[PDB]
Write an enzyme that holds these catalytic residues in place. Structure first.
Site, PDB file in Angstrom:
ATOM      1  N   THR A  65      49.493  54.791  43.608  1.00 51.31           N
ATOM      2  CA  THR A  65      48.209  54.566  44.257  1.00 51.31           C
ATOM      3  C   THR A  65      48.210  55.210  45.633  1.00 51.31           C
ATOM      4  O   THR A  65      49.117  54.982  46.428  1.00 51.31           O
ATOM      5  CB  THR A  65      47.900  53.064  44.386  1.00 51.31           C
ATOM      6  OG1 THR A  65      47.881  52.467  43.084  1.00 51.31           O
ATOM      7  CG2 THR A  65      46.552  52.845  45.050  1.00 51.31           C
ATOM      8  N   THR A  66      47.202  56.033  45.909  1.00 57.85           N
ATOM      9  CA  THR A  66      47.065  56.670  47.209  1.00 57.85           C
ATOM     10  C   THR A  66      45.595  56.698  47.589  1.00 57.85           C
ATOM     11  O   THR A  66      44.768  57.220  46.837  1.00 57.85           O
ATOM     12  CB  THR A  66      47.634  58.092  47.194  1.00 57.85           C
ATOM     13  OG1 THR A  66      49.014  58.048  46.812  1.00 57.85           O
ATOM     14  CG2 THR A  66      47.525  58.717  48.570  1.00 57.85           C
TER      15      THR A  66
ATOM     16  N   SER B 254      53.352  56.723  40.717  1.00 60.11           N
ATOM     17  CA  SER B 254      52.232  55.808  40.868  1.00 60.11           C
ATOM     18  C   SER B 254      50.942  56.520  41.245  1.00 60.11           C
ATOM     19  O   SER B 254      49.946  55.853  41.540  1.00 60.11           O
ATOM     20  CB  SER B 254      52.560  54.741  41.912  1.00 60.11           C
ATOM     21  OG  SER B 254      53.652  53.940  41.496  1.00 60.11           O
TER      22      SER B 254
ATOM     23  N   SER C  93      51.102  53.337  47.726  1.00 60.33           N
ATOM     24  CA  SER C  93      52.522  53.610  47.535  1.00 60.33           C
ATOM     25  C   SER C  93      52.851  55.069  47.818  1.00 60.33           C
ATOM     26  O   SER C  93      53.893  55.371  48.410  1.00 60.33           O
ATOM     27  CB  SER C  93      52.936  53.238  46.114  1.00 60.33           C
ATOM     28  OG  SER C  93      52.304  54.085  45.171  1.00 60.33           O
TER      29      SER C  93
END
EC number: 3.4.25.1
Lengths: 215, 213, 238, 228, 240, 191, 201
Positions: F1-2, F169, F130
Site C-alpha cells: 500500500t502506497t 504490498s 508500507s
C-alpha cells in the site's frame, strides 16, 4: 499508552538572573526513521509559565489541548488571578500519577519553566509521577550528556546572566548533535522574563569535523 | 512493556529519646545510574510534635504525603483538636492496607512525642504493619545502620557496661557518625544530611554536608 | 394563595413566593456584622442563649487558614453547606497546591444553591452566610442569600433588627480603610449594640469575634479573649 | 402549607419539625446533671403492668464504656439512633486507637437526623441526653429532632420538662459534688411524678473519671430512696 | 388561569401561561441595550446601586462566555449565572471536538434549545432571563442575537431588554448604525441610557459598557472609558 | 500500500495503488484506496482494511451532519480533527494511516497527516503506507516549491511508480484525483 | 516464626517467639506475635504481618458490637467462624494467615485454628509457624491433660526454645500467656540467651 509511535528527544532548561531558558529541537522521529522534520515541541502558556516535553508526541497534543482550555477558563472570569508556574507543576503531577494508576500511562517527560513574583521556577515531571525542582534540568540522553556540563558551571558560579545562560545552552545543544542518534540540526529557544514568554526561531548549530582528516 | 515501579534510594533514621525525638535523612534523589538532584529532603513536619519520613518510590511518597495532610484537617474540624502521635500511626495503617492488592512502594518511619512528653518511634512496612520501637533505620542503607545502633544505643553484646540513657548531645554525634560511615560504602547516600529535632519547645533543623561523589 | 405552594409555580405577578419566604428565615437568626480595612477583615457575631444555664450556640466557624464564615438561619442548612465548603477548600490544596481565591469559591455556592431553587423535590437553603477571606488581592467581605445571589461589599449586617446596624456602618464607612485592629474591631461591635434592646449590654459570654489578616491566620476568639477587646468602651447614651 | 417538609411558611418555618418537637412531650421525664466529680442521670419508668417485665423497658442504654444515654419520645426511632451511635464510636477506635470524645459522638448522630428530606422521609421523634467523661473531663450534651446540638450543665426533658427546669435552675451551682447531685435530682422527680416514689419507679446511672464502669445502680438505689 | 399551574398543560384556547408569566418577570428588571456597528458590537447596561454598600463593580450583568462572546443579561440574576455557565461549557466542547472557535449562529441555537427544555416538563419551570449575544470575526463580521425565556432566538441590529424595551428602541432606530464606527457608537450608547429614567424615581445607577469588534482584534472586554470618562461628559450635555 | 498527497496553488493532488493483499496472496486486485467524505474533501487510507472503513463511515456521518446545521461548506481542518478524536481515543485497537486532503474556500488546498499514533500535522506533501519508505529519498530531492497542477500530476505519477516498481504490498494500477475550486477530476492510469 | 497452643485442665497456654525477618535480613527481635483481642480472647500471628494484624483487629471491632447489642460476651466458636467467612471471600487473591483463637467459654475452654485457605478445625494441641514441626515432638512427649500449672509453664517454655534452636527464622524472646476462666493473664517474657544458661547448665 503501551507503545509510543512518534517520539521526541532531550529537552534542556536552566535558570538565570530573572528568567528561565528552555531549548529543544524540531524532530518527529518514528523509531529510526525521522518522519517529521518540522514540529514545535515547546508550548507557550499564558504569560509567565512555559512547557516543553519529550516522549510521545500524540500524548503531547492531548495535554496541549487540555492545558490550553484551562488557561482560557480562568481568563474569562477576570477576577485578577492566574495560574502560578508552581500550580501547573502541581496539577500536572496529579494528572500523571492518576493516569499510571489505571495502568494506561502517558508516555511523556515534561519540563516546566516559569517566572513569577520576581522568582524563577524550573520543574520536572516524569511519566511515573516523579517530580522535583532543580536549577538545571535535562531529559533523555541529555541527562547523561548535557547534565554534567550544567552542574559544572553552576557549582563554580551559582548565578548566571542571560547572555551567559543562552551561550551555555548552545554549547550543550551542539554536543547532543554529535552523539545522539535522534538529534536534529534545527532547534528553537524559548525564554521567560518579566516581559513575558518569547520563543526564538529555528536556529542551527556550528559543527567541527577536523578530526576526520586524522586516521 | 510498561512497568509501574522504580527504585529511588534514600536512608531515614529515627531515635526515640527520653524527652525528644531525632529524625534524620539524606537529600540525594537518584534513579538507575543518574543523579536527579542533590537537594530533596525526606523530612515532613506533619504537626508541631510529629515528623514523618518517606523512602522508596518517590511518586508514591508525594502522593501519600498529601493524603495524610488532608486527613489532618479532616480530623481537626470534626474533633476540635489535633491528632496524637499514636493516632497517626493507627490511621496510616488503614491507608496502607486500603491498596493491599496494588501496594505503595514506601517505607515509613514516624517519630515524635507522645502525650506524656517522651519519645516515640513507629516503623512501618509497605502493607501496613507497625510497632513501637526505640530506634529504626529504613531505606537503602538499612542493613548498614542497625548493627551499629544495637551496640551503642541498645548496648547489645557488651559486658560490664552500665545502661545510661542517651542524652541529647550524645545522640547528635551518633547520628553524625553513622551517616559518614554509611555514605562511604553505599552509593544511594550523600550530598547532605537533614536532621530534625522534636522537643517540647518546637522543631529544630540542622544540615550537615557529606561527600559529593 | 394557590400559587404559594411550590418552587416551580410562577405567579401572575411574576414572583415566586417560596424564595421570598426563605428570606424570612434569615431574619429569625441573630445579628452579625462584618467589615474590612485595607489589610484586615473582621466579622463579629452575636450569640443567643437557649436556656439560663446551657452553653450559647456558636456562630463563627473556621473553614480554612484564610477563610472564615458567619451564620444566620437554619442550622440544618448551615452544616450542610459547611461540609460542601470544606471539601472544595482541600481539593485545591490537593490538586493545585494553592489556596482558593475567595471570589471564585462563592461562585460555586451560587451554582450549588441554584438547583434546589428550580427543581422540585428540595426546598431552598435557608441560610445567611457572611464570608471573609484572603486571595492575592487583599481582604474581602461577601454575603449570600437564599435567592442564590452573592454580593461583594465592604460592610454588611444581616439578621434580626440589623437595619439599625446598617445605619451605623454607612456614616462610618469612610473611616474603615485606615484604622487598625485596636479600633477596627471596636468599630464593628459598636454596630451590634444598636441591634440590642436598650436595657442589657454586650457581655463577654454572648459575643464572638473572628479575625483573619494579611499576615494573620483566621482565629476565633470567644468568652476569654474578648476582654482585651471590650476594654476601652463607652456606654450607650441613655 | 403545613403538611410538607419541602414547604416554607410566610413567617418562617416548619410546621413539620415543630410537630416533631411536640412528640417528645408525651414521653417520660429524664434528668441529667453535670458535676466536676462526674455525671449522674435519672429517669422515670412508667411501668404499665405487673406481668410486664421491667428490664425490657430501657431508658438508659450504654453507648460505650465511658458514655451513657437517655431518651424520651418515640421508642421506635430511638433504637435506630442508638445503633449507629454504638457503631460510630466503634469505627473511630478501629482507625485511631483512641476513645471518641462525647461531643464528637453527637456530631455523627446529628449528621443523619438532618437527612429526612435532604437526600438527592420524616424527621425523628426523640430527644437524647448524652453523658460521659472524656479527656476534657465530664460532659453533658443534648440534641433534638432538628439536629440542633448544644452543651448543657443540667437538663431535664420529656414530659414534665418545663416544670422540672424551673426547680432545677434553683438548686444548681458550680461547686456541687456527685453524691449531693444524686439526691438533689430525685427530690425533683417525686415532685413531678404522680405515683409514690419507690425502688421500682426510677433507675439511676452515673459515670466517674476513674470509675468508667457502672452506668447503673443495682439496689443501692434502695439506700438512696430510704434516706430522702 | 387555573389551567396555568404546570408548564406541560395547555389552555382551552391554546397557550402556556407559565411561559407567559416568566416573560414579564424580565420586564421588571432594569434596561440593558445592545447595538452593533459595521465593524463591532457595543453593549450597554443601566445598572442601579442597591443602597450604598455596593462595592463598585459587584454582581455585573456583562458576562464573558468565550474569547469573542459575551452576554448582556437582565432579569433574575442568579438564574442568568447558571445559564451563563452552560454557554461556557458548550463552547468548550466545540473547541475540543472541532478545533476552532464557536460560530455565534451555532452557539445561540445550542443555548435556546437548552432553554426550550425547561418549558416542557412539570418538574422544572421556565427560566426568568433574557439576554444578548454579540461577537465579531473576520470571516463572519459582527452579529447580535436575542433570546427570550421561551427560546425564540434570531438576529437584530439593535435591541433593549428591561422596563424600557419599547421606550429605548424608539430612539435606537433613528441612528445610522450601518456606517458608524464603534468608537463613535460608545458616546451614542450613553445618551440612550440617560434619556429614559436613570435616577428619576430611582435612587442611583452606574453605567457599564462592554465592547467587541475590529479594534479589539476579536477580543471581548470592558471599555476604557474610565480612561477620559467621555461617555458621561458627552451624554450629560443632553440636558437641554 | 502506497498513498500520496501533494498540494499546489489551486488545490491538492492525490494518488494511490490498489493491491489489497493478505499474506502473500492478493485478495483485491483493483481497489478504491481514496474515499469521498464531502464534495471537496477526500481521504486516502492505510493500515487494516476493516478498521479504516469503519472510521471513514463515522466521520462522513458526523461531518455530513455537521455542515447541514451551519449551512456552510466544512473546513478541511475540521475534518482532520475528527479523525484525530477517534484514532487517539481508540488507540491500541486500530491501525490507521489516514491522510486527509482537499480544497477549502477559506484557505485553499490543505494536506494533513494522521499516522498510526494519533497526531495531526499539516504538510506540503505527504506519503504513507508500507511502500512509502522506498521513495522518501526521491520525494524530497524532486519536490520544488511553486508547482502547477500538471506538474503535480506528473510528480505523483513518477513517485508512485517507483514504490509500485515491484514491492509486494504495492503495484497494480494508479488512481489519481485532483481537487480544486471548480471540481474533482479523477482518472485511472495504466501503461 | 513459631507459635503453639494447648489446652488442659486449668485452661489454655499460649506461647510464641518474637523474631520477624525480611528475606535473609532480621527486621526486629521484639515483635509481639500474640494479639490481645479482648480481655477474654487471644489471637496469634503466623504468616503475614499486616494480614494477621488487620483482620483480627476487624474481628475485635465486631465482637464489641455483638456484646453491646446482646448484653453478653461472644462465644469462642462464634468468633472463629466470623473470621473464617471474612478471609474466604478473598480466597486465591494471595492472603497469608494461619492464626489461632483462644479463650474461655460457657462450654469451658476454647481452641480453634483458622487458615487463610479456609480450614477451621478445633482440637487440643496446635503448633503453627515455620519452626512449628520442631515443636510438635517435644510438646507431645511431655503433654498430658492433668499437668500442673507450673509444669505446663515449663513445657511450653522448653518447646519454644527447642524450636528456635534448630530453626533459623525463630528467636528473640519467649512470650507466655495463660487463659484463666475469668480472663487471660500474662505470665512472663524470657530471652532465649537467658534460657540457654539455665537449660544447658
Amino acid at each position: 499508552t503501551q507503545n509510543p509511535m512518534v517520539t521526541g528527544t532531550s529537552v534542556l532548561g536552566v535558570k538565570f538572573e530573572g528568567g528561565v531558558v528552555i531549548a529543544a529541537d524540531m524532530l518527529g522521529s518514528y523509531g529510526s526513521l525521522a518522519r517529521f522534520r518540522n514540529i514545535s515541541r515547546i508550548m507557550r502558556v499564558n504569560n509567565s509559565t512555559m512547557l516543553g516535553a519529550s516522549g510521545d508526541y500524540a500524548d503531547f497534543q492531548y495535554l496541549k489541548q487540555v492545558l490550553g482550555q484551562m488557561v482560557i477558563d480562568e481568563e474569562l472570569l477576570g477576577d485578577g488571578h492566574s495560574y502560578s508556574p508552581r500550580a501547573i507543576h502541581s496539577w500536572l503531577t496529579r494528572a500523571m500519577y492518576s493516569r499510571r494508576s489505571k495502568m494506561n500511562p502517558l508516555w511523556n517527560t515534561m519540563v516546566i519553566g516559569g517566572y513569577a513574583d520576581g522568582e524563577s521556577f524550573l520543574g520536572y515531571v516524569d511519566m511515573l509521577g516523579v517530580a522535583y525542582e532543580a536549577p538545571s534540568l535535562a531529559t533523555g540522553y541529555g541527562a547523561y550528556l548535557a547534565q554534567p556540563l550544567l552542574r559544572e558551571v553552576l557549582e563554580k558560579q551559582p548565578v548566571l546572566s542571560q547572555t551567559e545562560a543562552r551561550d551555555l545552552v548552545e554549547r550543550c545543544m551542539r554536543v547532543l548533535y554529535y552523539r545522539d542518534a535522534r538529534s536534529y540540526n534545527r532547534f528553537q529557544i524559548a525564554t521567560v522574563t518579566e516581559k513575558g514568554v518569547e520563543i526564538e526561531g529555528p536556529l542551527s548549530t556550528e559543527t567541527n569535523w577536523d578530526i576526520a582528516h586524522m586516521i | 512493556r510498561f512497568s509501574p515501579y522504580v527504585f529511588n534510594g534514600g536512608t531515614i533514621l529515627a531515635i526515640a529519646g527520653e524527652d525528644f525525638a531525632i529524625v534524620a535523612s539524606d537529600t540525594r534523589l537518584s534513579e538507575g545510574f543518574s543523579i536527579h538532584t542533590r537537594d530533596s529532603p525526606k523530612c515532613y513536619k506533619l504537626t508541631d510534635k510529629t515528623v514523618i519520613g518517606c523512602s522508596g518510590f518517590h511518586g508514591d511518597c508525594l502522593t501519600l504525603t498529601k493524603i495524610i495532610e488532608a486527613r489532618l484537617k479532616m480530623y481537626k474540624h470534626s474533633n476540635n483538636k489535633a491528632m496524637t502521635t499514636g493516632a497517626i500511626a493507627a490511621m496510616l495503617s488503614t491507608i496502607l492496607y486500603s491498596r493491599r492488592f496494588f501496594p505503595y512502594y514506601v517505607y515509613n518511619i514516624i517519630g515524635g512525642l507522645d502525650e506524656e512528653g517522651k519519645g516515640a518511634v513507629y516503623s512501618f512496612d509497605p502493607v501496613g504493619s507497625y510497632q513501637r520501637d526505640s530506634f529504626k533505620a529504613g531505606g537503602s542503607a538499612s542493613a548498614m545502620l542497625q548493627p551499629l545502633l544495637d551496640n551503642q544505643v541498645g548496648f547489645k553484646n557488651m559486658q560490664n557496661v552500665e545502661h545510661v540513657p542517651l542524652s541529647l548531645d550524645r545522640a547528635m554525634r551518633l547520628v553524625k557518625d553513622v551517616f559518614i560511615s554509611a555514605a562511604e560504602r553505599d552509593v544511594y547516600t550523600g550530598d547532605a544530611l537533614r536532621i530534625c529535632i522534636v522537643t517540647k519547645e518546637g522543631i529544630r533543623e540542622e544540615t550537615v554536608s557529606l561527600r559529593k561523589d | 394563595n394557590q400559587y404559594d405552594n411550590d418552587v416551580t409555580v410562577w405567579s401572575p405577578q411574576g414572583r415566586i413566593h417560596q424564595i421570598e419566604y426563605a428570606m424570612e428565615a434569615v431574619k429569625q437568626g441573630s445579628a452579625t456584622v462584618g467589615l474590612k480595612s485595607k489589610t484586615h477583615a473582621v466579622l463579629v457575631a452575636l450569640k443567643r442563649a437557649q436556656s439560663e444555664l446551657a452553653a450559647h450556640q456558636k456562630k463563627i466557624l473556621h473553614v480554612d487558614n484564610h477563610i472564615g464564615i458567619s451564620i444566620a438561619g437554619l442550622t440544618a442548612d448551615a452544616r450542610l453547606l459547611c461540609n460542601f465548603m470544606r471539601q472544595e477548600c482541600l481539593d485545591s490544596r490537593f490538586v493545585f497546591d494553592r489556596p482558593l481565591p475567595v471570589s471564585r469559591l462563592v461562585s460555586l455556592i451560587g451554582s450549588k444553591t441554584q438547583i434546589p431553587t428550580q427543581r422540585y423535590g428540595r426546598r431552598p437553603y435557608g441560610v445567611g452566610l457572611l464570608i471573609a477571606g484572603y486571595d492575592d488581592m487583599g481582604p474581602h467581605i461577601f454575603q449570600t442569600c437564599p435567592s442564590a445571589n452573592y454580593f461583594d461589599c465592604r460592610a454588611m449586617s444581616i439578621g434580626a433588627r440589623s437595619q439599625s446596624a446598617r445605619t451605623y456602618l454607612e456614616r462610618h464607612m469612610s473611616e474603615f480603610m485606615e484604622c487598625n485592629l485596636n479600633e477596627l474591631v471596636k468599630h464593628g461591635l459598636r454596630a451590634l449594640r444598636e441591634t440590642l434592646p436598650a436595657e442589657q449590654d454586650l457581655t463577654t459570654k454572648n459575643v464572638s469575634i473572628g479575625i483573619v489578616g494579611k499576615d494573620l491566620e483566621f482565629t476565633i476568639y470567644d468568652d476569654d479573649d474578648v476582654s482585651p477587646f471590650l476594654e476601652g468602651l463607652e456606654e450607650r447614651p441613655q | 402549607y403545613d403538611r410538607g417538609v419541602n414547604t416554607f411558611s410566610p413567617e418562617g418555618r416548619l410546621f413539620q419539625v415543630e410537630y416533631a418537637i411536640e412528640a417528645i412531650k408525651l414521653g417520660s421525664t429524664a434528668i441529667g446533671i453535670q458535676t466536676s466529680e462526674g455525671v449522674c442521670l435519672a429517669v422515670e419508668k412508667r411501668i404499665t403492668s405487673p406481668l410486664m417485665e421491667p428490664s425490657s423497658i430501657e431508658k438508659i442504654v450504654e453507648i460505650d464504656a465511658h458514655i451513657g444515654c437517655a431518651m424520651s419520645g418515640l421508642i421506635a426511632d430511638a433504637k435506630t439512633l442508638i445503633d449507629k451511635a454504638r457503631v460510630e464510636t466503634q469505627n473511630h477506635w478501629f482507625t485511631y486507637n483512641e476513645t471518641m470524645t462525647v461531643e464528637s459522638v453527637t456530631q455523627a448522630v446529628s449528621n443523619l437526623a438532618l437527612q429526612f428530606g435532604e437526600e438527592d422521609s420524616r424527621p425523628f421523634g426523640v430527644a437524647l441526653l448524652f453523658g460521659g467523661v472524656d479527656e476534657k473531663g465530664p460532659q453533658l450534651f443534648h440534641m433534638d429532632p432538628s439536629g440542633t446540638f448544644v452543651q448543657c450543665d443540667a437538663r431535664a426533658i420529656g414530659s414534665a420538662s418545663e416544670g422540672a427546669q424551673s426547680s432545677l435552675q434553683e438548686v444548681y451551682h458550680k461547686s456541687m459534688t456527685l453524691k449531693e447531685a444524686i439526691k438533689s435530682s430525685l427530690i425533683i422527680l417525686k415532685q413531678v411524678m404522680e405515683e409514690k416514689l419507690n425502688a421500682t419507679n426510677i433507675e439511676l446511672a452515673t459515670v466517674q473519671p476513674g470509675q468508667n464502669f457502672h452506668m447503673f445502680t443495682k439496689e443501692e438505689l434502695e439506700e438512696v430512696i430510704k434516706d430522702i | 388561569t387555573g389551567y396555568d399551574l404546570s408548564a406541560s398543560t395547555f389552555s382551552p384556547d391554546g397557550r402556556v401561561f407559565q411561559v407567559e408569566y416568566a416573560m414579564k418577570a424580565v420586564e421588571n428588571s432594569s434596561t440593558a441595550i445592545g447595538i452593533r456597528c459595521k465593524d463591532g458590537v457595543v453593549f450597554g447596561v443601566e445598572k442601579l446601586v442597591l443602597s450604598k454598600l455596593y462595592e463598585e463593580g459587584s454582581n455585573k450583568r456583562l458576562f464573558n462566555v468565550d474569547r469573542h462572546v459575551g452576554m448582556a443579561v437582565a432579569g433574575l440574576l442568579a438564574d442568568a449565572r447558571s445559564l451563563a455557565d452552560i454557554a461556557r461549557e458548550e463552547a468548550s466542547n466545540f473547541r475540543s471536538n472541532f478545533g476552532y472557535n464557536i460560530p455565534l449562529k451555532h452557539l445561540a441555537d445550542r443555548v435556546a434549545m437548552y432553554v426550550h427544555a425547561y418549558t416542557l416538563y412539570s418538574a422544572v419551570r421556565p427560566f426568568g432571563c433574557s439576554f444578548m449575544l454579540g461577537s465579531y470575526s473576520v470571516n463572519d463580521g459582527a452579529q447580535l442575537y436575542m433570546i427570550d425565556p421561551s427560546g425564540v432566538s434570531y438576529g437584530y441590529w439593535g435591541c433593549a431588554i428591561g422596563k424600557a424595551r419599547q421606550a429605548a428602541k424608539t430612539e435606537i432606530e433613528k441612528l445610522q448604525m450601518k456606517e458608524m464606527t464603534c468608537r463613535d457608537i460608545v458616546k451614542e450608547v450613553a445618551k440612550i441610557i440617560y434619556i429614559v429614567h436613570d435616577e428619576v424615581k430611582d435612587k442611583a445607577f452606574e453605567l457599564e459598557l462592554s465592547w467587541v469588534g475590529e479594534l479589539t482584534n476579536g477580543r471581548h472586554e470592558i471599555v476604557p472609558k474610565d480612561i477620559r470618562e467621555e461617555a458621561e461628559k458627552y451624554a450629560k450635555e443632553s440636558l437641554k | 500500500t502506497t498513498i500520496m498527497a501533494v498540494q499546489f496553488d489551486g488545490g491538492v493532488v492525490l494518488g494511490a495503488d490498489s493491491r489489497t493483499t493478505t499474506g502473500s496472496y492478493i485478495a483485491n486486485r483493483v481497489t478504491d484506496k481514496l474515499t469521498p467524505i464531502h464534495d471537496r474533501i477526500f481521504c486516502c487510507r492505510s493500515g487494516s482494511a476493516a478498521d479504516t472503513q469503519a472510521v471513514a463511515d463515522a466521520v462522513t456521518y458526523q461531518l455530513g451532519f455537521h455542515s447541514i446545521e451551519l449551512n456552510e461548506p466544512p473546513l478541511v481542518h475540521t475534518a482532520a480533527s475528527l479523525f484525530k478524536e477517534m484514532c487517539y481515543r481508540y488507540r491500541e485497537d486500530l491501525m490507521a494511516g489516514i491522510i486527509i486532503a482537499g480544497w477549502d474556500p477559506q484557505e485553499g488546498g490543505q494536506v494533513y497527516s494522521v499516522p498510526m499514533g494519533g497526531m495531526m500535522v499539516r504538510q506540503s506533501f505527504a506519503i504513507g503506507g508500507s511502500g512509502s519508505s522506498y521513495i522518501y529519498g526521491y520525494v524530497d530531492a524532486t519536490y520544488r516549491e511553486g508547482m502547477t497542477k500538471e506538474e503535480c500530476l506528473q510528480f505523483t505519477a513518477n513517485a508512485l511508480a517507483l514504490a509500485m516498481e515491484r514491492d509486494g504490498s504495492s503495484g497494480g494500477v494508479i488512481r489519481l484525483a485532483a481537487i480544486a475550486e471548480s471540481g474533482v477530476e479523477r482518472q485511472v492510469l495504466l501503461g | 516464626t513459631t507459635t503453639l497452643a494447648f489446652k488442659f485442665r486449668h485452661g489454655v497456654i499460649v506461647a510464641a517467639d518474637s523474631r520477624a525477618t525480611a528475606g535473609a535480613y532480621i527486621a526486629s527481635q521484639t515483635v509481639k506475635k500474640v494479639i490481645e483481642i479482648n480481655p477474654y480472647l487471644l489471637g496469634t500471628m503466623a504468616g503475614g504481618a499486616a494480614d494477621c494484624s488487620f483482620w483480627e483487629r476487624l474481628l475485635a471491632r465486631q465482637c464489641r458490637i455483638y456484646e453491646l447489642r446482646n448484653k453478653e460476651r461472644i462465644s469462642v466458636a462464634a468468633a472463629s467462624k466470623l473470621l473464617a467467612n471474612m478471609v474466604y471471600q478473598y480466597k486465591g487473591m494471595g492472603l497469608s494467615m494461619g492464626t489461632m483463637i483462644c479463650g474461655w467459654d460457657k462450654r469451658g475452654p476454647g481452641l480453634y485454628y483458622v487458615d487463610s485457605e479456609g480450614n477451621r478445625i478445633s482440637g487440643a494441641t496446635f503448633s503453627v509457624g515455620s519452626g512449628s514441626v520442631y515443636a510438635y515432638g517435644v510438646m507431645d512427649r511431655g503433654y498430658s491433660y492433668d499437668l500442673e500449672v507450673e509444669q505446663a509453664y515449663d513445657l511450653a517454655r522448653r518447646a519454644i526454645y527447642q524450636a528456635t534452636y534448630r530453626d533459623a527464622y525463630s528467636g528473640g524472646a519467649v512470650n507466655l500467656y495463660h487463659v484463666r476462666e475469668d480472663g487471660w493473664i500474662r505470665v512472663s517474657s524470657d530471652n532465649v540467651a537467658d534460657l540457654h544458661e539455665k537449660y544447658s547448665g
